[PDB]
Design a protein around this motif. Structure first.
Motif, PDB file in Angstrom:
ATOM      1  N   UNK A   1      47.827  34.745  24.408  1.00  0.00           N
ATOM      2  CA  UNK A   1      48.490  35.151  24.433  1.00  0.00           C
ATOM      3  C   UNK A   1      49.237  36.092  25.653  1.00  0.00           C
ATOM      4  N   UNK A   2      48.973  36.589  26.830  1.00  0.00           N
ATOM      5  CA  UNK A   2      48.929  37.261  27.509  1.00  0.00           C
ATOM      6  C   UNK A   2      50.486  37.915  27.923  1.00  0.00           C
ATOM      7  N   UNK A   3      50.423  39.140  27.876  1.00  0.00           N
ATOM      8  CA  UNK A   3      51.529  39.824  28.103  1.00  0.00           C
ATOM      9  C   UNK A   3      51.577  40.184  29.289  1.00  0.00           C
ATOM     10  N   UNK A   4      52.751  40.783  30.160  1.00  0.00           N
ATOM     11  CA  UNK A   4      52.459  42.059  31.197  1.00  0.00           C
ATOM     12  C   UNK A   4      53.262  43.010  31.128  1.00  0.00           C
ATOM     13  N   UNK A   5      52.123  43.984  31.027  1.00  0.00           N
ATOM     14  CA  UNK A   5      52.741  45.678  31.045  1.00  0.00           C
ATOM     15  C   UNK A   5      54.026  45.412  32.124  1.00  0.00           C
TER      16      UNK A   5
ATOM     17  N   UNK B   1      47.039  40.010  24.792  1.00  0.00           N
ATOM     18  CA  UNK B   1      46.764  41.300  25.058  1.00  0.00           C
ATOM     19  C   UNK B   1      47.988  42.068  26.460  1.00  0.00           C
ATOM     20  N   UNK B   2      47.616  43.153  26.950  1.00  0.00           N
ATOM     21  CA  UNK B   2      48.603  43.117  27.755  1.00  0.00           C
ATOM     22  C   UNK B   2      48.408  44.154  29.365  1.00  0.00           C
ATOM     23  N   UNK B   3      48.666  43.430  30.388  1.00  0.00           N
ATOM     24  CA  UNK B   3      47.674  43.925  31.307  1.00  0.00           C
ATOM     25  C   UNK B   3      49.037  43.927  32.284  1.00  0.00           C
ATOM     26  N   UNK B   4      48.910  45.031  33.321  1.00  0.00           N
ATOM     27  CA  UNK B   4      49.821  44.726  34.531  1.00  0.00           C
ATOM     28  C   UNK B   4      49.485  44.378  35.387  1.00  0.00           C
ATOM     29  N   UNK B   5      50.848  44.562  36.433  1.00  0.00           N
ATOM     30  CA  UNK B   5      50.449  43.225  37.806  1.00  0.00           C
ATOM     31  C   UNK B   5      50.124  44.099  37.990  1.00  0.00           C
ATOM     32  N   UNK B   6      48.559  42.837  39.112  1.00  0.00           N
ATOM     33  CA  UNK B   6      48.020  42.424  39.712  1.00  0.00           C
ATOM     34  C   UNK B   6      45.897  43.290  38.750  1.00  0.00           C
ATOM     35  N   UNK B   7      46.048  43.161  37.554  1.00  0.00           N
ATOM     36  CA  UNK B   7      45.094  43.585  37.105  1.00  0.00           C
ATOM     37  C   UNK B   7      44.217  42.020  37.019  1.00  0.00           C
ATOM     38  N   UNK B   8      43.124  42.069  36.332  1.00  0.00           N
ATOM     39  CA  UNK B   8      41.767  41.752  36.419  1.00  0.00           C
ATOM     40  C   UNK B   8      41.549  41.305  34.870  1.00  0.00           C
ATOM     41  N   UNK B   9      42.226  40.124  34.321  1.00  0.00           N
ATOM     42  CA  UNK B   9      41.599  39.514  32.790  1.00  0.00           C
ATOM     43  C   UNK B   9      41.481  38.611  32.488  1.00  0.00           C
TER      44      UNK B   9
END
Lengths: 215, 225
Positions: free
Chosen positions: A104-108, A12-20
């Motif tokens: 694998x956690x990605x940072x959008x 997945x790919x989430x933005x900074x401050x997102x709740x994953x």
RNA sequence: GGUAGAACACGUGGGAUAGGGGAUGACCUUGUCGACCGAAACACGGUCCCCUGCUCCUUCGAGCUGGCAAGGCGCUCACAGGUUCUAC
């Protein structure tokens, strides 16, 4: 039958401050003897969560774990630029212990154009008998990018390799290297060499070229 | 300072044996459970084996039963993993981990090792060639330039690339190796530096390849133009 | 040698549905099914019943159940018999 643990999602790919949230489902009852580890690329995994719902001493409070029967959820309330890794669930309820496939956690990130450089073959490499010309795409986002090679204004295919770094943990950017390898005779048979880069951060393909034998 | 230093990994023929060692410091393995877990290149963590603190009870994975054997020495405070009849499926980075204390944590592995690489291949060892990728003279007079090193034609993994003997870290990018058609490995390591210091600061890349015992300190200088 | 009784150790055949408005013998072992400790996933050593029940002159007390199952012992009923002792 051993106890397999299916992890979701695989990436997945989430933005900074997102709740994953990452889920992990056990094949059968494993009580609360599950743990959540975080592994950096090429580094030793770190213990984040033990006993399903307890965070290990020293782990920031943004990481949490919960259990709903056979499902186990690892949550990050506000994702950080340093939280890039592959996360794993591991049961310790019975032997043989098993891990999950991993997430694998990605940072959008916002789209960032790359910095393009070109490197001609060294004189030492020319003495070795081969010639590898390098093309560098530094600090960009997203990871998708296309690189083409032009030898005397002619496309090349099959004779080029490429590698991509992992995300930096302070800027969430990428770096790509593209190596075009030729024999010394084939390198000396032509004149100008160009690397053409297409990326979403660009409005037009950026071309970096050089004439061999001249500086 | 709890730490685990692993050793004994390397290139093994398809079918040979090898004993990996895991020395402990800061604690005694006689009071803890010691686990071995492996990871193939590009794959997830695979639990290999485990040994218990007071009974010596061992547990193995269904894929390494009989071939592998986990053991431990209290007097030397070191765990061991003896693997026989190695196949290509066993090529992986192997880690030893300590199962933490049951009050502090649960059954989770609180401390881990940096791991050791085991390559199960009949191929031979080759030392790399190190070439300088000098900063271009015609770079449009930018604020920052790029310079690097190409580490080509080596086998097997891995190589350790640093800059200024481990003094330059920010802006360094060491790309993963790329297995080319010649069966050897090739990678690059670049760095972005202010172009106003190319004529004053000396930039040297340090490449180490332990499988071939080859260390190269290649100086990167821009060509005259 | 007779009658009768007692104390023991026995044999055989039975008995044990119910816990807060009250289950159990809150015995031993094993299997089991659970949590939690001792630096301790298995092996080793342990803990998990306020009430209530039972026992005892630890009697403002003290001691015996994490749950379940089986077996053994124990408790209880009946039938006699055996040893020792006592009385006539």
């Amino acid at each position: 039958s051993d106890i397999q643990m299916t992890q979701s999602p695989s990436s997945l790919s989430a933005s900074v401050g997102d709740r994953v949230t990452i889920t992990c489902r056990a094949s059968q009852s494993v009580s609360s003897a599950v743990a959540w580890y975080q592994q950096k690329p090429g580094k030793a995994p770190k213990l984040l969560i033990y006993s399903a719902s307890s965070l290990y001493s020293g782990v920031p409070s943004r990481f949490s774990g919960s259990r709903s029967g056979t499902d186990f959820t690892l949550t990050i309330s506000s994702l950080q630029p340093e939280d890039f890794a592959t996360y794993y669930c591991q049961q310790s309820y019975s032997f043989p212990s098993t891990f999950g496939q991993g997430t694998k956690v990605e940072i959008k990130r916002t789209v960032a154009a790359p910095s393009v450089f070109i490197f001609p073959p060294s004189d030492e490499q020319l003495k070795s008998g081969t010639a590898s010309v390098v093309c560098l795409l530094n600090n960009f986002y997203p990871r998708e990018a296309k690189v083409q090679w032009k030898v005397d204004n002619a496309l090349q295919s099959g004779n080029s390799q490429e590698s991509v770094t992992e995300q930096d943990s302070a800027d969430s950017t990428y770096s790509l290297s593209s190596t075009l390898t030729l024999s010394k005779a084939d390198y000396e048979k032509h004149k100008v060499y160009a690397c053409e880069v297409t990326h979403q951060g660009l409005s037009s393909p950026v071309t970096k070229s050089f004439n061999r034998g001249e500086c | 300072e709890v730490q685990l230093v692993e050793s004994g990994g390397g290139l093994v023929q398809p079918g040979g044996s090898l004993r990996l060692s895991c020395a402990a410091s800061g604690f005694y393995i006689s009071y803890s459970s010691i686990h071995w877990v492996r990871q193939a290149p590009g794959k997830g963590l695979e639990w290999v084996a485990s040994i218990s603190p007071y009974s010596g009870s061992t547990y193995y994975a269904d894929s390494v039963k009989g071939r592998f054997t986990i053991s431990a020495d209290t007097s030397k405070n070191t765990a061991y993993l003896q693997m026989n009849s190695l196949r290509a499926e066993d090529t992986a980075v192997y880690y030893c981990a300590r199962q933490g204390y049951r009050r502090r944590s649960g059954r989770g592995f609180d401390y881990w090792g940096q791991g050791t690489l085991v390559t199960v291949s009949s191929a031979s060892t080759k030392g790399p060639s190190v070439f300088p990728l000098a900063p271009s003279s015609k770079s449009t007079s930018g604020g920052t330039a790029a310079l690097g090193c190409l580490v080509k034609d080596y086998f097997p993994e891995p190589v350790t690339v640093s800059w200024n003997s481990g003094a330059l870290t920010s802006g360094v990018h060491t790309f993963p190796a790329v297995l080319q058609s010649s069966g050897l490995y090739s990678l690059s390591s670049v760095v972005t530096v202010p172009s106003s210091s190319l004529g004053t600061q000396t930039y040297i890349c340090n490449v180490n390849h332990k499988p071939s015992n080859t260390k190269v300190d290649k100086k990167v200088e821009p060509k005259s133009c």
